[PDB]
Amino acid sequence: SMWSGMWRRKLKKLRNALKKKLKGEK
């Protein structure tokens, strides 16, 4: 595989983090 076992959760984490950064914090 090209992707590690963790992938979707990493994308979820990325999304969450991006939204956090985009919004502010809360």
Side-chain angles (χ1 to χ4, degrees):
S1 175
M2 294 180 180
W3 60 92
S4 48
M6 197 189 185
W7 187 21
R8 290 182 179 180
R9 292 180 181 179
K10 225 184 179 181
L11 290 162
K12 185 177 179 180
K13 185 175 180 179
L14 185 66
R15 265 178 179 181
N16 185 262
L18 180 62
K19 186 175 180 180
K20 195 181 178 179
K21 287 175 178 183
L22 180 66
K23 183 181 178 186
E25 180 170 86
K26 292 182 281 185

